[PDB]
């Protein structure tokens, strides 16, 4: 039902809020990121668009560059510069002291086209030039050769999002939901699982918890709800990542630590009260449905 | 009926926190407040009803905000501040840019200033965390407001830096602004308060009735959009932006952006040029008019 020539689209603002419907008065559902690739299912006003993650939602029409499959196909091929820090900017000049062009977050990829002293030339999906830094990015080729996607690098960036807002919905360095801090720390590796916490409870191995905790591992998802009944199944509320000894991060009013333990002081009463079981997921990207890196994602591939 | 004298105030200690319509993430927000920013409690029910400084009212989650008696409320307000002056960066547990972050921080954030230490400035949190913030994007209190401009200039300086910052319905920090809230979120960074919503902001200070050629609006001015009003119905605001001269405006949609009055410009805006209502002239008047302030002319911030 899409017309030919804007079937396909690509996130041209560093982020982007997708809503329940096409209307400002609609909750928000999920973000996506400058330079993402979407399909596009309908337009109103408004366009409804289906994200690397298949989830769907509403988003304004300024903020989406509608294309061709042959346009899409061509962003998608295109060396990207990634950006790695949580905040920045670019430029209309390679100089920190020009005018900005748009602020950028982690994990948006802009087009590379060239390099002028400490920073990379860039394109923009709509058209614009700017500059970024090298402190603050690289291309995507130097960027996937030396990436980590182990627990221990995953923690590691975690930790960098610690005071963080919490908000409701938020896929971002600028402020994350409990399954969006998980989903905004693994696109940081390149890694993509479903949006939300009930979906993602459901991909890799289900660990059933042991008193102890002495089988739950660094980098496990902990899930978190309402213990299923002979009547009733279970209904998953809220997820954060283990990090061992009791303790683990999740987004909560903001980002933070808490524990299992009542010995230490961060111990979450309500929380521990309500834990359910643990997922092991990081050693089955790509082997699995709804688990994948960026480069074996159909959305970012010609198909 | 008022909250027991231990909870009746309240501080925000979070970089921005979302006010909802209704205590409940479910519900649409519809304002944001700034770390260490003074608020009123009106309520809790698991959520807190706040009312802050420009007297808008909104729910947030118990965890975001810590509440206060009016004593120590008052000793809050009273602590030389250090104030964010950059749109985004960090606090850090050691006075090095390598240790461990504490949150991060917006423009308009402002902390207890604790002391210094090479390059950084101690604070400390309204919930008692304490940090280290570079020099290079805070400032104490004292000498920001000795150098603070207030000008049509200097603030259209400051909404340029804004340029490509994404639109968010109910945004009021520099992570993400709706129309009004871009406004409000320049005019908080040169320590100035005025309504929260496109419909207030159009009737504080001088309405200009624009000529033709734009002859008689100025630089800092506002631009407001909507519905003419007709016989039977009264004016409906829609939209708001800043005026720049020579027929441009700065405005949030899609994005902040710059937009012409003028069909011979590359950034002509058709649809909002036909919707064009009226301007104000509002920075002659700030502390002269209700609902126009400086944070230290704002009885939020002082004891009263
Ligand atoms: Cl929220
Ligand atoms: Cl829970
Ligand atoms: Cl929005
Ligand atoms: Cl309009």
Not at 163 to 169: F, K, N, Q, T, V
Not at 266 to 279: I, K, P, Q, S, W
Request: hydrophobic share 35%; glycine share 8%; with cysteine.
């Amino acid at each position: 039902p899409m017309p030919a020539d804007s079937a396909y689209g690509v996130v041209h603002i560093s982020v982007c809020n997708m809503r329940d419907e096409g209307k400002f008065t609609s909750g928000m559902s999920t973000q996506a990121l400058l330079g993402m690739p979407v399909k596009v299912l309908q337009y109103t006003g408004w366009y409804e668009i289906q994200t690397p993650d298949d989830y769907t939602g509403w988003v304004h029409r300024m903020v989406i560059t509608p294309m061709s499959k042959e346009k899409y196909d061509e962003w998608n091929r295109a060396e990207k510069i990634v950006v790695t820090s949580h905040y920045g900017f670019t430029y209309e000049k390679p100089d920190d002291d020009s005018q900005t062009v748009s602020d950028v977050v982690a994990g948006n990829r802009l087009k590379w086209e060239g390099s002028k002293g400490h920073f990379y030339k860039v394109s923009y999906p709509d058209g614009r030039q700017a500059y970024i830094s090298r402190h603050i990015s690289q291309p995507e080729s130097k960027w996937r050769a030396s990436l980590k996607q182990d627990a221990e690098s995953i923690i590691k960036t975690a930790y960098t999002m610690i005071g963080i807002p919490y908000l409701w919905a938020g896929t971002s360095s600028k402020g994350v939901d409990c399954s969006g801090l998980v989903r905004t720390v693994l696109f940081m590796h390149d890694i993509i699982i479903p949006r939300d916490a009930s979906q993602q409870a459901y991909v890799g191995e289900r660990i059933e918890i042991a008193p102890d905790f002495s089988n739950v591992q660094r980098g496990d998802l902990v899930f978190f709800g309402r213990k299923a009944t002979a009547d009733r199944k279970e209904g998953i509320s809220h997820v954060g990542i283990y990090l061992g000894n009791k303790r683990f991060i999740h987004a909560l009013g903001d980002v933070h630590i808490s524990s299992f333990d009542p010995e230490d002081e961060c111990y979450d009463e309500f929380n521990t009260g309500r834990l359910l079981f643990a997922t092991r997921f990081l050693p089955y990207i790509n082997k699995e449905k709804g688990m994948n890196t960026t480069d074996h994602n159909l959305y970012y591939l010609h198909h």
